């Protein structure tokens, strides 16, 4: 039942995202409501989060692949829909496998940007 509910919610959110994409093409991305400016964000992370690196492509693309278990998939998407991961950057979900990969990539991004600030603050 949880799997079915999560899948339907994702589909509904994606459908709403397409409808909102029509309106951001009319009034720019502010003029919708607060709710439809949180739907867009969590539904611009779902789209980025649906991409997965395949182990078969390790040689060509270099990046190591991921095999996401079904249990992880349901929880990972379920948490995103509720809004638990509303502070993670959008790009952390692009070509990553599982929720843990999202978090580790966030560490590598937050720490990476830390050096950039110390550089840009200095020099």
């Amino acid at each position: 039942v949880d799997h079915y509910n999560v899948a339907q919610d994702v589909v509904q959110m994606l459908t709403k995202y397409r409808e909102l994409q029509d309106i951001i093409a009319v009034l720019g991305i502010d003029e919708l409501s607060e709710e439809d400016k949180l739907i867009v964000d969590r539904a611009r992370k779902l789209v980025k989060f649906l991409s997965q690196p395949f182990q078969v492509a390790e040689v060509f693309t270099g990046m190591t692949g991921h095999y996401v278990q079904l249990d992880d998939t349901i929880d990972s998407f379920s948490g995103l829909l509720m809004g638990t991961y509303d502070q993670v950057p959008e790009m952390a979900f692009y070509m990553v496998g599982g929720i843990n990969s999202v978090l580790e990539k966030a560490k590598k991004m937050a720490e990476e940007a830390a050096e950039l600030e110390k550089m840009r603050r200095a020099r």
Partner: peptide, 30 residues
């Protein structure tokens, strides 16, 4: 007021999520 008075795999995600966001706040500070 009473609620304030009173107070494993999922913990790791919470730890990482908290720690991940900990640096995001620190970078903003300085």
């Amino acid at each position: 007021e009473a609620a304030e008075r009173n107070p494993t795999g999922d913990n790791a995600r919470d730890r990482l999520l908290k720690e991940v966001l900990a640096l995001q706040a620190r970078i903003n500070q300085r």
